[PDB]
Structure 1
Amino acid sequence: AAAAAANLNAVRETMDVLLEISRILNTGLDMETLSICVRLCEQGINPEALSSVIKELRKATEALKA
């Protein structure tokens, strides 16, 4: 009932706040990408590995930009 949708608001509000801390810590992640990583994490993606894969592709992105 009301808690089915009240769940969607909590995860929205709470997605907003640790986005904000992501911005503070200067991670580079925008909202869109952040969410992707939340999903990946929740599926079982190891955070170390996931950061690491974010790092290296930023790297190639930057380098592939030339």
Structure 2
Amino acid sequence: NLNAVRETMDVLLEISRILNTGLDMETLSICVRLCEQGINPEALSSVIKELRKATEALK
């Protein structure tokens, strides 16, 4: 199973590159594994922009 999800993740990198996302490899891995568990992804799209903003307020 781990061979399949790795290949699908490698394909998921290129389409998140041309769609101009804020993701790099680490937040792609955490958020794809989070989506695999299954919750509404429309709220995850807001929590990610909040996490980066709330770290940026410290800097």
TM score, norm. by length of structure 2: 0.78
Deviation at 1:9, TM superposition (A): 2.6
SS in 2 for 1:64: coil
User: How many Å separate the matches in 1 of 2:23 and 2:52?
Assistant: 11
Gaps of 5+ in 2: none
Cα separation, partners in 2 of 1:23 and 1:45, compared to 1, 3 Å: same
Higher-helix-fraction structure = 1
User: How many Å separate the matches in 1 of 2:51 and 2:16?
Assistant: 18
Q: Percent identity, aligned pairs only?
A: 100
Deviation at 1:25, TM superposition (A): 1.3
Tell me the alpha carbon deviations over residues 25-58 of structure 1, each in whole angstroms, 9 at most, x when there is no partner. Answer: 1211111221111121121221111110001111
TM score, norm. by length of structure 1: 0.72
Higher relative contact order (CA closer than 8 Å, sequence separation 6+): 2
Deviation at 1:15, TM superposition (A): 0.6
Say yes or no: does 1:17 pair with 2:42. Answer: no
Deviation at 1:14, TM superposition (A): 1.5
Q: How many residues align?
A: 59
SS in 2 for 1:29: coil
Gaps of 5+ in 1: 1-6
The CA RMSD measured in Å over matched residues stands at 1.5
